[PDB]
């Protein structure tokens, strides 16, 4: 029922996750709390360079 | 119902995610069976101290119960073949939480846990403690020999199967199998307009056979055409029944 016959579920999930407002608890290191996810995203958006689709492609 | 929920939730806790979807579908049919006799799915408030709503029970209900039993065999086998012989399941449940009969007595353990510790304790099969037709049926009860989680799981599955068997036996006890045959040719004479043509189950044949006088009075007089019955209804629903003073302890 998200879209027609559920064709946009992933789009809705991603947009909602964008919309949600993050809060950092006290007692945690704010810099590290925000920096580890950034590093994780930067690392995970590199795996696509270690891919092969046909010879020397 | 209870063993289905317990097994499914235990499997979900261990890590088997899909099995919970099946027991919940097969316990929806039993919820429908509740709803067909009292109008509620969980909180029946069905049993009464001295009253039984006889009109709530029909022959068409027992046939659907037999259909449910036949398909419950298949659903229970479906749950069986992803858990019982699984190496991960065995390594997660075998020799976990092992105890003997001494702990099983010290901590007042009863039921499936007591049958897993090795003790033979079933209130239905006890001579002095039985209740509600259980003493005059024929079913099996299961005891473990290791006292661990695997024994409890297997005992719960076997108890579900034996519950199916007990239900079948009860329906047979309220059933009319033999018929009238022609004097010549030994050919059955089936009724055409009688209600017994639709099915072989008559849930009032025993009650009408023995307590005919009470069956007749209950089916003819209600609180709309009898003074005594209206007084009884008023007192019952305004103040309740009166119970003579005393102490009792009853277990099930």
């Amino acid at each position: 029922y998200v879209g027609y016959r559920g064709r946009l579920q992933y789009i809705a999930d991603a947009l909602k996750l964008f919309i949600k407002g993050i809060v950092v608890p006290e007692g945690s290191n704010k810099f590290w709390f925000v920096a580890i996810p950034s590093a994780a995203g930067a690392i995970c958006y590199t795996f696509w360079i270690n891919s092969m689709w046909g010879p020397s492609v | 119902l209870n063993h289905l929920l317990a097994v499914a939730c235990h499997a979900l806790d261990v890590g088997s995610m899909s099995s919970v979807f099946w027991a919940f579908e097969e316990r929806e049919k039993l919820m429908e069976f509740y709803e067909r006799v009292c109008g509620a799915r969980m909180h029946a408030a069905f049993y009464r101290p001295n009253e039984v709503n006889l009109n709530a029970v029909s022959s068409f209900l027992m046939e659907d119960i037999l259909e449910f039993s036949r398909n419950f065999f298949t659903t229970l086998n479906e749950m069986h073949n992803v858990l019982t012989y699984n190496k991960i399941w065995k390594q997660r449940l075998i020799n976990i939480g092992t105890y003997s009969f001494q702990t099983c007595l010290d901590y007042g353990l009863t039921g499936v846990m007591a049958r897993s510790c090795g003790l033979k304790r079933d209130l239905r099969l006890s001579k002095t403690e039985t209740y509600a037709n259980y003493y005059y049926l024929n079913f099996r009860s299961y005891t473990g020999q290791h006292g661990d989680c695997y024994d409890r799981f297997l005992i719960r599955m076997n108890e579900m199967c034996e519950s199916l068997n007990i239900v079948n036996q009860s329906i047979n006890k309220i059933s009319k199998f033999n018929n009238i045959v022609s004097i010549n040719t030994k050919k059955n004479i089936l009724n055409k307009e009688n209600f017994n043509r639709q099915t072989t189950v008559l849930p009032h044949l025993v009650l009408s056979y023995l307590n005919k006088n009470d069956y007749n009075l209950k089916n003819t007089k209600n609180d709309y055409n009898s003074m005594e019955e209206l007084i009884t209804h008023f007192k019952y629903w305004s103040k309740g029944l009166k119970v003579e003073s005393g102490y009792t302890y009853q277990s099930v």
């Binding site: 998200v2 | 919940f24 929806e28 969980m42």
Partner: protein, 162 residues
């Protein structure tokens, strides 16, 4: 005036998304919890309407109170409500949560979960059937979809909001 040209359409896209993925908190008390778990399984699939359960309040969008609330649990419920990420909605399921219920005259039961946290919608039964729970969740989804633009602004002579 000109900002609305961008804001009014985008609003829908913001609502639709949060209507398409409405994740409630995995939290159940008493036996409305069992009824809710029935409402989650394949017979009534919340996953059809994009409703999936998250265990931590930081990833939850809807708090679903589905059981009796005692005086021992009220501070915990208040903390769980406070620790959910905004925006959030609260569903009250069953009699024990909507009011006192079958224990309204007791010494240790909160006479309704709305004495502790705000409640967005109430589901009356005891227990409310999975039919009724799905009805209430769908009603809440439609309401929160429409809740971003209810015509609060006035239209000027150019048919533009404020």
């Amino acid at each position: 005036m000109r900002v609305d040209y961008i804001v009014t359409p985008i609003n829908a896209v913001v609502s639709w998304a949060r209507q398409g993925s409405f994740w409630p908190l995995t939290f159940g008390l008493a036996c409305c919890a069992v009824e809710m778990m029935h409402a989650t399984v394949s017979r009534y699939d919340f996953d059809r309407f994009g409703v999936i359960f998250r265990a931590t309040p930081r990833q939850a969008d809807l708090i679903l109170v589905a059981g009796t609330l005692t005086n021992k649990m009220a501070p915990g419920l208040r903390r769980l409500y406070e620790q959910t990420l905004d925006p959030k909605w609260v569903l009250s399921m069953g009699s024990c949560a909507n009011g006192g219920g079958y224990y309204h005259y007791s010494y240790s039961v909160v006479r309704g979960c709305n004495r502790i946290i705000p409640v967005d919608i109430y589901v009356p039964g005891c227990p409310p059937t999975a039919e009724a729970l799905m009805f209430g969740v769908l009603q809440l989804q439609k309401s929160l979809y429409r809740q971003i633009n209810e015509g609060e602004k006035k239209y000027n002579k150019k048919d533009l909001t404020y």
